[PDB]
Design an enzyme around this catalytic site. Sequence first.
Site, PDB file in Angstrom:
ATOM      1  N   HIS B  39      -7.576  43.422  -6.141  1.00 25.09           N
ATOM      2  CA  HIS B  39      -8.446  42.267  -5.899  1.00 25.09           C
ATOM      3  C   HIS B  39      -9.898  42.644  -5.626  1.00 25.09           C
ATOM      4  CE1 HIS B  39      -9.070  42.368  -1.468  1.00 25.09           C
ATOM      5  NE2 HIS B  39      -7.806  42.735  -1.350  1.00 25.09           N
ATOM      6  N   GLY B 144     -12.859  43.912   5.265  1.00 20.74           N
ATOM      7  CA  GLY B 144     -13.255  45.225   4.818  1.00 20.74           C
ATOM      8  C   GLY B 144     -12.197  46.293   4.998  1.00 20.74           C
ATOM      9  N   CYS B 146      -9.155  46.262   3.648  1.00 16.32           N
ATOM     10  CA  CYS B 146      -8.269  46.393   2.497  1.00 16.32           C
ATOM     11  C   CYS B 146      -8.431  47.746   1.827  1.00 16.32           C
ATOM     12  CB  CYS B 146      -8.520  45.266   1.497  1.00 16.32           C
ATOM     13  SG  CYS B 146      -7.504  43.780   1.883  1.00 16.32           S
TER      14      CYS B 146
HETATM   15  C1  LIG Z   1      -9.068  43.284   2.827  1.00 17.17           C
HETATM   16  O1  LIG Z   1     -10.520  44.155   2.834  1.00 17.17           O
HETATM   17  C2  LIG Z   1      -8.760  41.818   3.574  1.00 17.17           C
HETATM   18  C3  LIG Z   1      -8.548  41.980   5.053  1.00 17.17           C
HETATM   19  C4  LIG Z   1      -8.415  40.610   5.823  1.00 17.17           C
HETATM   20  C5  LIG Z   1      -9.554  40.328   6.315  1.00 17.17           C
HETATM   21  C6  LIG Z   1      -9.148  39.446   7.698  1.00 17.17           C
HETATM   22  N1  LIG Z   1      -8.064  40.001   8.217  1.00 17.17           N
HETATM   23  C7  LIG Z   1      -7.423  40.846   7.060  1.00 17.17           C
HETATM   24  O2  LIG Z   1      -6.435  41.500   7.092  1.00 17.17           O
HETATM   25  N2  LIG Z   1      -8.077  40.722   3.019  1.00 17.17           N
HETATM   26  C8  LIG Z   1      -8.625  39.446   2.655  1.00 17.17           C
HETATM   27  O3  LIG Z   1      -9.765  39.208   2.843  1.00 17.17           O
HETATM   28  C9  LIG Z   1      -7.668  38.461   1.984  1.00 17.17           C
HETATM   29  C10 LIG Z   1      -8.169  38.261   0.572  1.00 17.17           C
HETATM   30  C11 LIG Z   1      -7.025  38.625  -0.346  1.00 17.17           C
HETATM   31  C12 LIG Z   1      -6.150  37.383  -0.418  1.00 17.17           C
HETATM   32  C13 LIG Z   1      -5.172  37.472  -1.583  1.00 17.17           C
HETATM   33  C14 LIG Z   1      -5.939  37.744  -2.863  1.00 17.17           C
HETATM   34  C15 LIG Z   1      -6.530  39.113  -2.740  1.00 17.17           C
HETATM   35  C16 LIG Z   1      -7.622  39.035  -1.683  1.00 17.17           C
HETATM   36  N3  LIG Z   1      -7.514  37.165   2.618  1.00 17.17           N
HETATM   37  C17 LIG Z   1      -6.490  37.197   3.633  1.00 17.17           C
HETATM   38  O4  LIG Z   1      -5.967  38.230   3.855  1.00 17.17           O
HETATM   39  C18 LIG Z   1      -6.173  35.952   4.445  1.00 17.17           C
HETATM   40  C19 LIG Z   1      -5.099  35.648   5.308  1.00 17.17           C
HETATM   41  C20 LIG Z   1      -5.445  34.320   5.777  1.00 17.17           C
HETATM   42  C21 LIG Z   1      -4.848  33.365   6.660  1.00 17.17           C
HETATM   43  C22 LIG Z   1      -5.451  32.123   6.919  1.00 17.17           C
HETATM   44  C23 LIG Z   1      -6.665  31.778   6.312  1.00 17.17           C
HETATM   45  C24 LIG Z   1      -7.263  32.694   5.455  1.00 17.17           C
HETATM   46  C25 LIG Z   1      -6.642  33.951   5.203  1.00 17.17           C
HETATM   47  N4  LIG Z   1      -7.044  34.959   4.408  1.00 17.17           N
END
Ligand SMILES: *C(=O)[C@H](C[C@@H]1CCNC1=O)NC(=O)[C@H](CC1CCCCC1)NC(=O)c1cc2ccccc2[nH]1
Lengths: 301, 299
Positions: B39, B144, B146
């Site tokens: 992603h 950040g 991920c």
């Molecule tokens: C990776 O760098 C991140 C880490 C997130 C940031 C906040 N806490 C974490 O673990 N992951 C994300 O930003 C994801 C985006 C992915 C979603 C699926 C498609 C690929 C990208 N978003 C979430 O992890 C997430 C969980 C959640 C629950 C409620 C509202 C929003 C939400 N977003």
Amino acid sequence: SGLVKMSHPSGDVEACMVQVTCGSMTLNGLWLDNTVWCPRHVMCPADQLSDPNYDALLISMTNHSFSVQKHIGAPANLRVVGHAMQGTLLKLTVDVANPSTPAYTFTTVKPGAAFSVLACYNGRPTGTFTVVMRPNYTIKGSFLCGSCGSVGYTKEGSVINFCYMHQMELANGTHTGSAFDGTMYGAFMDKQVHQVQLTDKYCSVNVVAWLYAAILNGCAWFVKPNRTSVVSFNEWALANQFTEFVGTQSVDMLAVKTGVAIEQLLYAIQQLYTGFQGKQILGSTMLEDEFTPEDVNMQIM
Amino acid sequence: LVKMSHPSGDVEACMVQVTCGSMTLNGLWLDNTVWCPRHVMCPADQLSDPNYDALLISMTNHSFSVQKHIGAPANLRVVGHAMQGTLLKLTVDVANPSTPAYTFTTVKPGAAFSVLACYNGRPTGTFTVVMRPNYTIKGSFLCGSCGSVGYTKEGSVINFCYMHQMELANGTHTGSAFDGTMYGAFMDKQVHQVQLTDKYCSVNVVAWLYAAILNGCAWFVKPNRTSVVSFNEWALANQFTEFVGTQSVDMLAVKTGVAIEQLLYAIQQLYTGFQGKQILGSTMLEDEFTPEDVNMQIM
Ligand SMILES: *C(=O)[C@H](C[C@@H]1CCNC1=O)NC(=O)[C@H](CC1CCCCC1)NC(=O)c1cc2ccccc2[nH]1
Ligand SMILES: *C(=O)[C@@H](C[C@@H]1CCNC1=O)NC(=O)[C@H](CC1CCCCC1)NC(=O)c1cc2ccccc2[nH]1
């Protein structure tokens, strides 16, 4: 869904771990620049653990009484060229600066503050965990025999603060050691004798941080309008096994991000100390003093 | 009774930052290969409904950037991209000289591993988690993070078992195994997804009580016993996991001389309630210490 026990990445400290053998004793040492630190009871004979003459053992040692070995990663030949004693610590000079010496300081931790420990056996790092220095100057870790010389530390920016080197397990499964100035935490004695520890107390300021961490995570049933002043709380704390509460800018930050004053949680704590009425807070039916304001600020942000 | 990670020095030497256009995250550099969540390719417009095949087709090798910020700093040239499940497998021009002896295995619910949390390719924290029966982990992750990697070490071999992908509706986390599949079959799309209701890790409650017996808490132990298979069936309706015996479990049954079946009778007893009493200071069942933990920490 709560915090986790976060420790710092141990790689900086791994590259600094060595084995120190003296006479019958083998334990871990910390090699920084031309120095290897280790507990001074590596000098003690197996018969005389109960009360050693440390001044007589040091006179009795030579540079050839100590062997140093680096096993992990970049291996090396380490030759002791000076020896000295500093409180409960040995300061061994070797002829090679550690080429992986991180920027570092020696600062003593005060109770309530958290730090990472790398547990080593025979110079080999085996696991890492985090502890808080309890008010009775002990820590609740996992230390088996051979873990002495294992190091506690924190990192800020590029600088590691070494705060702890492991020396003994007390009668309970409780541990203690030295700061790198040589003093033992709690003024315990490096001798195998009976030493009775003072009572453990709740780290009030870390209880408040954990309560703030609950509030940030939607768990706020314990918050009421009522308040207890710092001064009233610190009087009640003296009589209830709680440390005095000193506010910091990390707490103030949580107060701001949440709308709930420190004094509301001080009153909350007085209630929750009695009992939780059957409810939970962040999956606990007890108060939690093992996360700091800095922990809460960094992990929920 | 402490939660212990593996020393992370070996994994720190393989962390890198990967940038695709405006999106940046952490990768794992091993040999000539850099793994990261796919992603990184997804623009903010497509977060809700991403077409990765279309996004992938749109990328050249030059759309990807790999930076190493810790250890021997460098810039690696991306010379190959491929997609593997929910992960991106890029091929770079230099082979990581600190490539540890590694394997790729998928962890099973109840198993414990170590997480190295990184940000912009820089390690910042380490912690341990057990994989939950709903195939989530109770982690501590922010924006950040991920690409941060979970792993176990079997002696000198590092077993990479997890690459972080997302937070769920709760503060609970999942990622990909290095075959590229997501734990819990969660999707890499920004849509509300539903965890399966969690259960207790039966093999880990057993270990927890074998630690109690070792540390003077045998009150629950009765001469009454329940078979593995009967508990199993009961477990499927009272939200407990299936018990699979192990060597380490047997040692906690050998030198405390207590039978596994007795604890499996107790746990059905204490699931209703503890009778008001406490085991190791706790009012509830604990399932996030494994037999290997107990064996290692109460040797
Ligand atoms: C990776 O760098 C991140 C880490 C997130 C940031 C906040 N806490 C974490 O673990 N992951 C994300 O930003 C994801 C985006 C992915 C979603 C699926 C498609 C690929 C990208 N978003 C979430 O992890 C997430 C969980 C959640 C629950 C409620 C509202 C929003 C939400 N977003
Ligand atoms: C270092 O490698 C030591 C650490 C402890 C071993 C088990 N878990 C630990 O943390 N081991 C020691 O044995 C230490 C020995 C020296 C102490 C200072 C003076 C010279 C000997 N001894 C103890 O920690 C110790 C104290 C005890 C009281 C009661 C039972 C067992 C005890 N062990």
